[PDB]
């Protein structure tokens, strides 16, 4: 507990008294697993004590041990946070990131971080206090690994956050030191970049241009074969990200020889990395014929059967959806090439799950190739649907005729209307 004589030498005028008392304050909160936040953030005006002293530049320890103590309310809940906040903290840390002391830059960049990974609204109230440029004169000036990984990891926090995202143009110019920082070694910096960058593409096609143009492709793809699972994860969720822009970003992904690296990835030994590695083919394939055909090439399809008959139906559904979308703006080659490998039976096979969107996908796919069978039936003359005979060796028919009684509209509206269409 915090003691009234702890208190009153918090007041006091003697910078010995203030240091120890502050160095007990910062021991007592770094206490876990349930450090006294609340009753020292109760206690009135020694959040603001701590604030008071972090403008002590004459006094190093007192600078450092007052920055640590509010680094580790920062710590806690959004509302142990905001009083941090609203004593006029960060305004002080950010220009204390540019401290003689190296410690107190570090603790700085660490309080910094913590106040910017709470919340998207302690994340913007940092940005809008202008610290991405002091953090980046910061990250290329610093002689501390320690110091280094902090920056970075504050950085990635600050482009953290969908809902709402960060203001695109006030994070952006972090993106020249992410493209650099991605050449490093160590496995926390590619970490937390790789983080910062899987976020700074999931938007529009725009933001995906600002991270090409930085250069980061190559280097994400090659992270994509990293053995720490920390590094491999996001840098796949980066590259799968960008494979969402137009056909000629998602182009400059495929020139960085990523498909190799993705069918590697499909025989990952957990389940996450072929999840991710599926839904980034998926996008792929729903891209431009000639990428479909760069899918084809790399023998990537069977391994995409083989997952959408025998995997988890997580990732069953982004095979399915890789599978659905070549389908969908294929060639009749292509499209019979797919036939060809098999995939009409385990497409049936998933007509009958309880993920209505699975179901959907599936029925998506063998519309298209049931749409291919009629026009090939047509130039032929004979009105054959070739790719009619094999979903009924499938016992699909039947499956479809049974999703009529779905619950989703979607799903029986599309099986009554394949039915009427196709199989007449």
């Known amino acids: 507990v915090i003691t009234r004589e702890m208190v009153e030498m918090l007041f006091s005028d003697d910078s010995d008294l203030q240091l120890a008392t502050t160095q007990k304050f910062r021991k007592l909160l770094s206490k876990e697993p349930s450090p006294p936040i609340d009753e020292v953030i109760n206690t009135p005006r020694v959040v603001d004590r701590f604030v008071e002293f972090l403008k002590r530049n004459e006094n190093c320890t007192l600078q450092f041990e007052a920055a640590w103590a509010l680094t580790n309310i920062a710590s806690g809940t959004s509302q142990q946070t905001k009083i941090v906040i609203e004593a006029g903290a960060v305004p002080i840390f950010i220009e204390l990131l540019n401290s003689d002391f190296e410690d107190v830059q570090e603790q700085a960049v660490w309080a910094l971080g913590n106040i910017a990974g709470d919340s998207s609204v302690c994340r913007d109230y940092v940005l809008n206090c202008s610290i991405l440029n002091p953090l980046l004169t910061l990250l290329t000036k610093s002689t501390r690994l320690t110091m280094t990984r902090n920056a970075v990891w504050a950085l990635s926090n600050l482009c953290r956050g969908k809902n709402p995202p960060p203001e695109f143009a006030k994070v952006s110019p972090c993106l020249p030191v992410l493209s650099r920082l991605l050449f490093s070694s160590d496995s926390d910096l590619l970490a937390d970049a790789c ?148 995939c009409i039976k385990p497409l049936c096979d998933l007509l009958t799950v309880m993920d209505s969107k699975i179901v959907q996908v599936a029925l998506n796919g063998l519309e298209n190739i049931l749409r291919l069978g009629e026009q090939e039936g047509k130039r032929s003359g004979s009105g054959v649907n070739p790719y009619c005979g094999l979903i009924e060796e499938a016992y699909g028919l039947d499956k479809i005729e049974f999703l009529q009684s779905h619950e989703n509209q979607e799903i029986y509206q599309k099986a009554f209307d394949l039915i009427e269409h196709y199989f007449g």
């Open 195 to 342: 983080w910062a960058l899987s976020y700074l593409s999931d938007g529009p096609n725009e933001k995906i241009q600002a991270v090409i143009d930085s250069g980061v492709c190559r280097r994400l793809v090659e992270l994509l074969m990293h053995n720490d699972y920390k590094v491999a994860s996001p840098a796949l969720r980066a590259v799968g990200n960008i494979v969402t822009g137009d056909d000629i970003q998602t182009q400059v992904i495929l020139n960085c020889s990523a498909l190799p690296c993705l069918l590697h990835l499909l025989s990952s030994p957990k389940e996450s990395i072929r999840k991710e590695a599926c839904w980034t083919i998926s996008n792929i394939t729903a891209g431009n014929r000639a990428q479909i055909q760069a899918v084809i090439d790399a023998n990537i399809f069977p391994v995409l059967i083989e997952i959408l008959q025998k995997a988890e139906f997580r990732t069953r559904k982004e095979a399915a959806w890789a599978i659905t979308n070549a389908t969908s703006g294929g060639t009749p080659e292509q499209i019979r090439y797919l036939v060809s490998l098999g």
